[PDB]
Ligand binder design. Structure first.
Ligand SMILES: Cc1cc2nc3c(=O)[nH]c(=O)nc-3n(C[C@H](O)[C@H](O)[C@H](O)COP(=O)(O)OP(=O)(O)OC[C@H]3O[C@@H](n4cnc5c(N)ncnc54)[C@H](O)[C@@H]3O)c2cc1C
Ligand SMILES: O=CCCc1cc(F)cc(F)c1OCc1ccccc1
Length: 647
């Protein structure tokens, strides 16, 4: 349906109130059911008006004018619902044409640290709400971990590049607003072994299905058998995977043992039977000779010796009847051995590609992921196919930056917060002698988790952050993932596949250049460096790592088919001082709850909150994504306005 679709697109149940709405509308939840349904229709229709045209501000008046009778008669309730949706960034978010120009006198000063998607999303909200907002950004550009390389006709994303399903995804709104060219990813992904040979289809399917089985077994271990703690330590996904593989190997060795036992027993029966048949020949050879050694006692002696001879001969033919039914049982047993091994050496390498793919998705070696919680956010996945941004994902933060007071090359060094306000201290990255002091009423920190983890600290908080916050910072995972960009003047790969895989020769290096992406107008290939390889490869110069790419590609397509690239770029996110990694993951011994702790604002001791937090590491249901960063900025903007302008 139409207004039901609007609730779904806003990640809301179309036919009941959320807890958040119950808090804000307690008179509605406690009142008659009929009025609750009116509430839900006003809410849903208001979201639909916005989602149907997110390029213009949806005002209260225009909401009222487009509601049909009887709904356009309860002016007060319509206003209450519009205001709530607006305050929480469910309408009039992103970048859109303002109908009401900005209030000329501001109310409250907010310093936002970092001009990534989360800081930008919050900044636009707070500016719309009539506050004085300034973003301090250490880089010479906005976007943070959205970072697009552009040169000539080449476009390639070094950070985020994939939009997950559009159903429920706020990026569907921003896409319309910014005019992103999205293109669905084709799922075919042929694999090539380290020698460049294609993986045959049957081995590809067999190994993939085994990967799915192994992973489902860890989830059974975790969520049915509750094997999540061992020797007082949290079990990791990698650890659980090693256990389920050990049991598969045990199973192979057992069935092998059973099979050898069947062989041996059959051999022993034949050995015994032949020995018995041997003695029966000796017994018949002795009688057959006493049949030639030969009257009335003689005419009856032949009858008796022929009766005796041919009975042993019937005994012997019957034993040769069992002899065949045994050595034919032996013959098919030797021809039907069970498997020698669980995984052939090549099978294992292929299985390690699927593990590498998973270390890509989580940005970290599997031995670091929480067995119990590594996929705690699964239930919030959007619907629809995934897409890539053909024109470069930087179009989003560049569009969101329009009209904001953004200070580039301005690196925050110290954040001071008291019950009387805040001071942010920063230095000019092009001239670190120049120092700046920003006074404000509230600080919104969107620093990446990697920066918050840095010891000694990059940014100093005065007073120091509370232990409950720093230990959550310490527990949470912050992974790494890198990309080699190869720009050619000609397409030598299969233009109709967006993905192909390189199967590494060893487990430890399985994430090295394991996945290639064909996404762009110009002849560009992105290769991923995942897992353990991601951090280690940053120590390799561009030319050497490009050379290793070219060797892989020369193996797949032929040495003469691969020309030298015209431009190359290599990300080093861990070594990047303004990121120190790629994105959070649920580390063994962490949980979704640490994401809630990260989102919690700080209040100076006895008072009102001063220091606020946004960023991909602060949103439990959508971590490590652009949409989660965006949602987190909208959330903190609502919280800050509630504090400084009233709920
Ligand atoms: C390699 C890679 C691949 C990814 N794959 C995807 C994908 O395809 N799709 C997806 O949805 N997500 C993906 N992600 C994740 C997504 O890009 C991030 O989750 C999101 O961009 C983070 O936004 P943020 O605002 O939380 O942080 P950021 O974008 O990092 O914003 C923080 C900002 O603070 C700035 N800053 C740092 N230190 C200071 C300081 N001292 N003073 C001032 N400013 C400072 C930084 O420069 C930055 O601009 C990927 C990320 C990477 C790096
Ligand atoms: O390039 C960036 C990938 C990072 C990433 C981190 C997430 F936490 C969730 C994502 F959706 C995601 O991006 C697309 C993706 C989806 C599934 C598996 C792998 C990647």
């Amino acid at each position: 349906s139409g207004v039901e679709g609007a609730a779904f697109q806003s990640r809301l149940p179309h036919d009941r109130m959320t807890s958040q709405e119950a808090a804000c509308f307690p008179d509605i939840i406690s009142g008659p059911q009929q009025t609750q349904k009116v509430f839900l229709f006003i809410r849903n229709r208001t979201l639909q008006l916005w989602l149907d045209n997110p390029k213009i501000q949806l005002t209260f008046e225009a909401t009222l004018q487009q509601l049909e009778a009887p709904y356009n008669s309860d002016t007060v309730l319509v206003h209450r619902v519009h205001s709530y949706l607006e305050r929480h960034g469910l309408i009039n978010f992103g970048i859109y044409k303002r109908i009401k120009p900005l209030p000329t006198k501001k109310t409250g000063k907010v310093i936002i640290i970092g001009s990534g998607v989360s800081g930008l999303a919050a900044a636009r909200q707070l500016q719309s709400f009539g506050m004085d907002v300034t973003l301090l950004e250490a880089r010479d550009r906005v976007g943070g971990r959205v970072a697009t390389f552009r040169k000539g006709n080449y476009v390639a994303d070094l950070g985020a590049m994939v939009v997950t399903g559009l159903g429920g995804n706020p990026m569907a709104v921003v896409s319309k607003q910014v005019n992103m060219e999205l293109a669905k990813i084709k799922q075919k992904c042929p694999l090539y072994e380290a020698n460049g040979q294609a993986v045959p289809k049957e081995k590809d399917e067999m190994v993939e299905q085994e990967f799915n089985r192994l992973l489902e077994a860890t989830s059974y271990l975790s969520h049915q058998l509750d094997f999540n703690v061992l020797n007082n330590k949290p079990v990791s996904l990698g650890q659980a995977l090693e256990v389920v593989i050990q049991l598969q190997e045990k199973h192979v060795k057992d069935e092998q043992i059973e099979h050898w036992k069947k062989i041996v027993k059959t051999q022993e029966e034949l050995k015994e039977l032949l020995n018995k048949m041997v003695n029966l020949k000796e017994k018949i050879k002795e009688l057959h000779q006493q049949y030639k050694e030969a009257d009335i006692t003689a005419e009856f002696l032949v009858k008796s010796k022929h009766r005796d001879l041919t009975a042993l001969c019937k005994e012997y033919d019957e034993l040769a009847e069992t002899q065949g039914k045994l050595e034919e049982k032996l013959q098919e047993l030797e021809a039907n051995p069970p498997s020698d091994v669980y995984l052939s050496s090549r099978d294992r390498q292929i299985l390690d590609w699927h593990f590498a793919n998973l270390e890509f998705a989580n940005a970290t070696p599997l031995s670091t992921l929480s067995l119990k919680h590594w996929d705690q956010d699964d239930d919030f996945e959007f619907t629809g196919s995934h897409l890539t941004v053909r024109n470069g994902y930087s179009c989003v933060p560049v569009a969101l930056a329009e009209g904001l007071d953004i200070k580039l090359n301005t690196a925050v060094r110290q954040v001071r917060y008291t019950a009387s306000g805040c001071e942010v201290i920063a230095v000019n990255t092009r001239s670190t002698s120049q120092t700046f002091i920003y006074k404000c009423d509230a600080v919104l920190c969107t620093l990446p988790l990697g920066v918050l983890k840095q010891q000694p600290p990059a940014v100093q908080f005065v007073p120091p952050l509370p232990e409950w916050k720093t230990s959550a910072v310490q527990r949470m995972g912050f992974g790494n993932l890198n990309k080699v960009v190869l720009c050619f003047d000609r397409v030598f790969w299969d233009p109709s596949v967006n993905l192909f895989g390189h199967v590494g020769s060893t487990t430890a290096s399985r994430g090295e250049l394991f996945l290639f992406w064909n996404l762009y107008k110009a002849p560009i290939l992105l290769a991923l460096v995942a897992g353990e390889a991601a951090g280690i490869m940053e120590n390799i110069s561009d030319d050497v790592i490009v050379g290793r790419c070219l060797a892989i590609l020369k193996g797949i397509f032929g040495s003469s088919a691969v020309p030298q690239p015209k431009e190359t770029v290599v990300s080093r996110w861990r070594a990047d001082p303004w990121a120190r990694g790629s994105y959070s993951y649920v580390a063994a011994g962490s949980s979704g709850n640490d994401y809630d702790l990260m989102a919690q604002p700080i209040t100076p001791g006895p008072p009102i909150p001063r220091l606020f937090f946004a960023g991909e590491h602060t949103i439990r249901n959508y971590p490590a994504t652009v949409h989660g960063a965006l949602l987190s900025g909208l959330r903190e903007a609502g919280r800050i306005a509630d504090q400084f302008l009233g709920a």
